[model samples]
Target: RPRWKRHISEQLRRRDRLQRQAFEEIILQYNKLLEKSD
Candidate 1:
């Protein structure tokens, strides 16, 4: 049971990292679009 819990936690951490990277990339694209509009 403890091992299963650790595995789940690790998966969650990896998913969070992926989400953070995608969020930053989206923000960067938005910033570029805004600058081009100006």
Candidate 2:
């Protein structure tokens, strides 16, 4: 049971890391758009 829990936890960690990376990219893109409004 513990092994199964660890496996799931690891998967979630991987997903969170990817999500953070994607979020950063989005923020950068968003900033670029703001520049055009100036």
Candidate 3:
């Protein structure tokens, strides 16, 4: 693959990792809220 393509893929991977982390954090917080409401 070309250098530019590799760079783009690396950036996309980093973004995906960040989004996944944020989504997991939200899910955990929501679960905690539900548990406290019970």
Candidate 4:
């Protein structure tokens, strides 16, 4: 069997950096929302 993979490490790293930052922001906002909703 043979398989092929795309060389996407660089692209993934770029996206991951932004995604991680946004994820942290999202978590903060989510916590704030929950606190207000409580």
Candidate 5:
């Protein structure tokens, strides 16, 4: 049971990392678009 719990936590961490990277990518794109508008 403990091993299974650890596995779940590891997966959650990996998912969070992916989400963070995607969020950053979106922010960067928005910044570029804003610069073009100015």
Candidate 6:
């Protein structure tokens, strides 16, 4: 009989979420700086 291994789906989802959040924050900051420079 073969045993099933648990997948790290939750970990993957968390990592993706954090990456997206970081990207959004960076873009927001860049836009703010651009507006200030204008």
C-alpha lDDT score of every prediction, in listed order:
0.91, 0.90, 0.93, 0.77, 0.91, 0.77
Best-performing candidate as measured by TM-score: 3
Ranked candidates (lDDT, high to low): 3, 1, 5, 2, 6, 4
> Residue-wise lDDT of candidate 3 within 1-38, one digit each (tens)?
99999999999999989898769989999999999999
lDDT of 6 by residue, 1-38 (tens): 22322246666778889898769879999999999999
TM-score of each: 0.51, 0.53, 0.54, 0.45, 0.52, 0.47
Candidate 3 TM-score, C-alpha based: 0.54
Q: Which parts of model 3 are misplaced by more than 4 Å?
A: 25-38
Give the Cα-based TM-score of candidate 5 against the true structure: 0.52
Name the weakest run of 10 consecutive residues (lDDT summed) in model 2. Answer: 16-25
In the predicted model 2, the residue pairs found to clash are none
Which lDDT value does model 4 have at 29?
Answer: 90
**lDDT (Cα, 0-100) at 32 in candidate 1:** 100
Residue range 1-38, candidate 1, lDDT tens digits: 69999999999999988998769889999999999999
- Give candidate 1's error at residue 35 in angstroms: 8.7
Candidate 4, poorest ten consecutive residues by summed lDDT: 1-10
Clashing pairs in 1: none
On lDDT, the stronger of 1 and 2 is 1
Question: How many Å off is the CA of 4 in candidate 6?
Answer: 13
Give the per-residue lDDT of model 2 (tens digit) for 1-38.
69999999999999988898769889998999999879
